[PDB]
Ligand SMILES: Oc1ccc(/C(=N\c2ccccc2Cl)c2ccc(O)cc2O)cc1
């Protein structure tokens with residue numbers, strides 16, 4: 001996956 | 011320029 | 020200064036009568052990347068001539084200087100070709116009607132690099148038009164808006180804005196005539212103009228692709244001048 | 251979806267409160283091609299983190315799937331940065347306010363290849379905003395419209411329903427400001443047409459960034475790279 005996935009969940 | 015020509019013809 | 024004096028009905032009338040013809044391709048059922056792009060380039064090259072004479076008939080366009088007329092077309096030519104494409108492809112779901120004898124689907128575009136993306140975007144735009152049940156009167160309005168708007172940011176510039184507002188009133192007049200509520204008029208107007216953002220996007224991507232296969236080999240002398248007007 | 255239930259006033263209020271902060275650039279004045287793009291890349295990389303959190307606050311955006319949220323941000327991120335730029339640069343004619351401590355004019359952009367064109371376009375947009383006397387409430391509507399519209403062609407009814415809601419909001423703001431009915435759909439039209447130019451400037455920006463990535467003429471961050479690889 002990508003960084004954007006994490007920042008959108010965190 | 012072709013465009014300038016066709017814009018007058 | 021006759022463009023600002025036209026009524027909404029006279030505006031639509033003028034634009035409808037100004038419509039370019041639907042040109043045919045040279046599609047001659049053989050079974051390639053070279054052939055397909057060659058057909059489209061040839062078609063676009065011939066459509067340009069009609070577009071130039073069509074642009075002359077767009078109210079207010081003539082009032083501009085030669086340099087301004089050139090610049091507006093150099094900016095918007097591929098946008099206009101594309102919105103023409105998605106419009107005549109409207110009632111051919113999953114297909115792109117480049118010409119009456121040239122109907123393509125997503126499977127064909129794959130035989131050219133990076134062509135699939137532009138195809139799906141065009142298909143989506145057409146599907147969007149279909150969903151909205153776009154009218155011809157609205158179409159010829161958007162097309163003329165594209166012409167006047169796409170290069171207006173690169174005593175005169177106020178004239179374009181005055182004409183742009185005129186076409187806006189025309190669009191609203193069309194919708195009010197169709198029985199749409201004032202809320203529905205605003206919303207539909209927004210929905211239509213928001214499409215132009217995507218058409219701009221498709222155009223820019225198209226330019227990149229054309230600039231790619233250019234220095235990779237054969238564009239026409241007119242289509243080259245239109246292309247060197249960007250990057 | 252609570253977004254559809256919001257009134258126009260409640261819509262504006264939610265968007266105003268969601269506004270990202272105006273960040274600063276790295277200090278110690280002194281502009282080379284490397285230093286300039288360095289500061290802008292650094293600045294953008296930090297704004298992205300606030301943007302992502304701002305997007306979460308945009309009514310209706312949370313209702314989308316994670317994949318949809320990613321795609322919308324990936325398509326619109328440079329547009330959003332740019333409309334932010336021209337907005338805060340509004341009352342600085344001939345200048346671009348990238349940051350309160352980073353105000354640039356057209357002369358500065360020339361020290362980087364192909365940068366002058368995008369600069370002039372940005373300045374022109376800002377001058378357009380200034381001419382129209384664009385309001386903050388209108389700006390935050392435009393920004394959110396960009397977020398939801400720019401990638402919606404690449405569920406779908408929901409975004410359209412939210413897009414219509416913001417249209418109603420824009421009209422409500424104008425009707426409140428005393429604009430006639432005709433003045434309302436003209437101004438609405440004028441505003442949305444800008445988004446076509448913002449789209450164009452973004453696309454031109456993407457090329458330039460993909461260019462300096464294939465030249466190492468400034469090292470992009472890992473998040474900025476992922477955003478860029480989404481437009482490959
Ligand atoms: O050399 C060219 C120029 C334009 C196209 C093309 N569009 C494209 C332009 C660039 C990339 C991809 C596409 Cl599909 C196109 C041609 C005619 C028309 O009526 C509508 C069109 O959209 C084709 C070849």
Ligand SMILES: Oc1ccc(/C(=N\c2ccccc2Cl)c2ccc(O)cc2O)cc1
Pocket residue numbers: 287290291292293294297331332334335348365368369454455456458459470474
């Ligand atoms: O690595 C980058 C990414 C974006 C920019 C940039 N814009 C550009 C992006 C590409 C080319 C030219 C420009 Cl001006 C920009 C940055 C922050 C901001 O608040 C607004 C912005 O417009 C800069 C560096």
